[PDB]
UniProtKB/Swiss-Prot annotation, chain C:
The lineage of its organism: Bacteria, Pseudomonadati, Pseudomonadota, Gammaproteobacteria, Enterobacterales. The N-terminal DNA-binding domain (residues 1-929) is a ssDNA-dependent ATPase and has ATP-dependent 3'-5' helicase function; both are stimulated in the presence of RecC, suggesting this domain interacts with RecC. Holoenzyme reconstituted with this RecB N-terminal fragment has no nuclease activity. The C-terminal domain (residues 928-1180) has weak ssDNA endonuclease activity as an isolated fragment. RecD probably interacts with this domain. The C-terminal domain interacts with RecA, facilitating its loading onto ssDNA. Interaction is decreased by ATP. Changing residue 25 to Q: Subunit loses ATPase and 3'-5' helicase activity, holoenzyme has 3-5 fold less helicase activity, 20-fold less processivity. The chain holds residues 5 to 139 of 1180 of the full protein. It comes from Escherichia coli (strain K12). It comes from the Bacteria. Belongs to the helicase family. UvrD subfamily. In the RecBCD complex, RecB has a slow 3'-5' helicase, an exonuclease activity and loads RecA onto ssDNA, RecD has a fast 5'-3' helicase activity while RecC stimulates the ATPase and processivity of the RecB helicase and contributes to recognition of the Chi site. The gene is recB. This is RecBCD enzyme subunit RecB. A helicase/nuclease that prepares dsDNA breaks (DSB) for recombinational DNA repair. Binds to DSBs and unwinds DNA via a rapid (>1 kb/second) and highly processive (>30 kb) ATP-dependent bidirectional helicase. Unwinds dsDNA until it encounters a Chi (crossover hotspot instigator, 5'-GCTGGTGG-3') sequence from the 3' direction. Cuts ssDNA a few nucleotides 3' to Chi site, by nicking one strand or switching the strand degraded (depending on the reaction conditions). The properties and activities of the enzyme are changed at Chi. Transmembrane segments: none annotated.
UniProtKB/Swiss-Prot annotation, chain D:
Heterotrimer of RecB, RecC and RecD. All subunits contribute to DNA-binding. Interacts with YgbT (Cas1). A helicase/nuclease that prepares dsDNA breaks (DSB) for recombinational DNA repair. Binds to DSBs and unwinds DNA via a rapid (>1 kb/second) and highly processive (>30 kb) ATP-dependent bidirectional helicase. Unwinds dsDNA until it encounters a Chi (crossover hotspot instigator, 5'-GCTGGTGG-3') sequence from the 3' direction. Cuts ssDNA a few nucleotides 3' to Chi site, by nicking one strand or switching the strand degraded (depending on the reaction conditions). The properties and activities of the enzyme are changed at Chi. Belongs to the RecC family. In the RecBCD complex, RecB has a slow 3'-5' helicase, an exonuclease activity and loads RecA onto ssDNA, RecD has a fast 5'-3' helicase activity while RecC stimulates the ATPase and processivity of the RecB helicase and contributes to recognition of the Chi site. This is RecBCD enzyme subunit RecC. The chain holds residues 727 to 790 of 1122 of the full protein. The holoenzyme may undergo conformational shifts upon DNA binding: the nuclease domain of RecB may swing away from the DNA exit tunnel in RecC. When Chi DNA binds to the RecC tunnel, the nuclease domain may then swing back to its original position (that seen in crystal structures), allowing it to nick the DNA 3' of the Chi site and then rotate to load RecA. At high Mg(2+) the nuclease domain may swing back more frequently, explaining differences seen in assays performed at high Mg(2+). The lineage of its organism: Bacteria, Pseudomonadati, Pseudomonadota, Gammaproteobacteria, Enterobacterales. Disruption phenotype: Decreased degradation of DNA with free ends that is unable to undergo homologous recombination, which can fortuitously lead to more efficient viral infection. Cells are deficient in DNA recombination repair and have increased sensitivity to UV light. The cultures have many inviable cells. Cells can be transformed with retron Ec48-containing plasmids.
Length: 264, 66, 135, 64
């Protein structure tokens, strides 16, 4: 299992272990992880079975596809990927290599309508001054086009501090890395297709707060702010979209689900 | 051409791929228009939605990325 | 055979505390927990602060674990709010806020520590050795 | 949305607790809005009132 995960995720350590030298900057157990892999390589070579594997196969594929003309033999015209949000970076390298000839359309989905990922360098943020066209009409970009990078939205070492919604700030660790990998390519096409939401119901208020990259929580730093309780938006007394029912036994909870669903 | 579309819902993106395959018909309709997914239930849902819209669902395959 | 305050005990070596019947044995342990999480206690304090993934606490019965974890979460949440508002009501939090050196740093540490609560180390003896041997 | 959890143990009537995600969600909800009754009373009191109002409490036996 560990070797399969290594084959999928780390090609460079396997390349080092093929020639047997250690990899500098790692903890224990590597001194027996490496020569076991090398001895497995020589044993499966002596068995006579084919030796082609994924870690060098990706590099060979990238080389033979980049060093090629515009006419490949027997490849499909187009293919779409949808409903996926966590991929190895080598797959993204393979698809950006494949993007020279075959048209693809990544149907990636994100909660927020703007950028909320990490930052590499102050030189790197200059690359993110492009635009995202709409479907047919105009273009769009993250708000405060100069003021975001001007102010302390991005700090020198870490990602985005003032995320806004604490829900996203707590739960978007996968999404930050995914948008960081996706917003780094050079042969890419970025254009949005979004749906607005009208805040009337409680759930729609929550979703609009998530989408708009804002916050609606008051802490009351000053005593006037602590005393007042009308700065918030009001609440419908019969908005029953979000509930919180507390039960004791699982069977009783399932019965509550049953008759509540029938009543609904 | 690597094209990326952001989203807030899956329905408008499914409508967009319907719009693409309608505004550009492949000259060999018997070719399997491959679509990648992450499960079997998602492929089932895409098949059901495509049959619901087009009145037909045939010659579409859903393999794993690997 | 001396007295005890939560803000005065030097946290080094081995110490034994006996709290008699009708003491509570919980309002103190949360105070020492926050004391180690924030690294206060003068020169007698620990040399460096820690994180929630290092403070192992082992009780014996099953039901006390979840109750202790919930009380701990409520205490750290209330301490964070009281630190952002600079005005408390509990004398314990009042003296802690008196002992605060940097409110912004303390608030940042509490923000980064509260969201890591879900994997914090509170076990029984059997669970502790079960999670150590498979490690 | 329908979110539920086991609140109290049925044997000794002790206390259990919901997960941290649900606790964060209800904290954000309580610090987000206010009930129409006490529109200008207190931020934290209104938050506690909203938390009490949204929570529903069932019983042990069906025929109560």
């Amino acid at each position: 299992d560990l070797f399969d995960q290594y084959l999928v995720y780390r090609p460079d350590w396997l390349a080092q272990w093929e020639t047997g030298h250690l990899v500098e900057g790692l903890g224990e157990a590597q001194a027996w992880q490496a020569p076991l892999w090398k001895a497995l390589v020589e044993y499966t070579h002596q068995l006579g079975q084919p030796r082609w594997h994924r870690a060098n196969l990706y590099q060979r594929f990238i080389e033979t596809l980049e060093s090629a003309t515009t006419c490949p033999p027997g490849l499909p015209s187009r293919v779409f990927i949808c409903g996926i949000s966590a991929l190895p970076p080598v797959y993204l390298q393979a698809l950006q290599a494949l993007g020279k000839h075959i048209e693809i359309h990544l149907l990636f989905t994100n909660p927020c309508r703007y950028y909320w990922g990490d930052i590499k360098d102050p030189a790197y943020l200059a690359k993110l001054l492009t635009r995202q066209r709409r479907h047919s009409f105009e273009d769009r970009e993250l708000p405060l086009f100069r003021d975001s990078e001007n102010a302390g939205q991005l700090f020198n070492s870490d990602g985005e501090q003032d995320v806004g919604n604490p829900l996203l700030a707590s739960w978007g660790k996968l999404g930050r890395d995914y948008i960081y990998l996706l917003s780094d390519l050079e042969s890419s096409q970025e254009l949005d297709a979004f749906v607005d939401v009208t805040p009337d119901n409680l759930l729609h208020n929550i979703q609009s707060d998530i989408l708009e990259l804002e916050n609606r929580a008051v802490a009351g730093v000053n005593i006037e702010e602590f005393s007042r309780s009308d700065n918030k938006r009001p609440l419908d007394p019969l908005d029953s979209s979000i509930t919180f029912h507390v039960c004791h036994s699982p069977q009783r909870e399932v019965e509550v689900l049953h008759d509540r669903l029938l009543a609904m | 051409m690597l094209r990326v579309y952001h989203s807030n819902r899956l329905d408008v993106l499914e409508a967009l791929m319907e719009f693409i395959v309608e505004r550009e018909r492949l000259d060999d309709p018997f070719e399997p228009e491959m679509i990648l997914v992450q499960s079997t239930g998602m492929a089932q849902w895409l098949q059901m939605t495509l049959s619901q819209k087009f009145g037909i669902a045939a010659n579409i395959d859903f393999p794993l990325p690997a | 055979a001396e007295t005890l305050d939560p803000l005065r005990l030097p946290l080094q070596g081995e110490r034994l505390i006996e709290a008699s019947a009708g003491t509570g044995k919980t309002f103190t342990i949360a105070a020492l927990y926050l004391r180690l999480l924030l690294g206060l206690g003068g020169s007698a304090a620990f040399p460096r602060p820690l994180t929630v993934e290092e403070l192992l606490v082992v009780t014996f019965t099953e039901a006390a674990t979840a109750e202790l974890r919930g009380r701990i979460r409520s205490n750290i949440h209330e301490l964070r709010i009281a630190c952002l508002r600079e005005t408390t009501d509990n004398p314990l939090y009042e003296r802690l806020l008196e002992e605060i050196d940097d409110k912004a740093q303390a608030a940042q540490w509490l923000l980064l520590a509260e969201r890591q609560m879900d994997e914090a180390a509170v076990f029984t003896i059997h669970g502790f050795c079960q999670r150590m041997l498979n490690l | 949305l329908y979110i539920s959890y086991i609140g109290r143990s049925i044997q000794d009537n002790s206390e259990r607790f919901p997960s941290v995600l649900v606790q964060e969600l209800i904290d954000y909800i309580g610090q987000s809005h206010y009930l129409p009754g006490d529109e200008a009373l207190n931020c934290d009191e209104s938050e506690a009132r909203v938390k009490a109002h949204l929570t529903c409490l069932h019983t042990r036996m069906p025929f109560d």
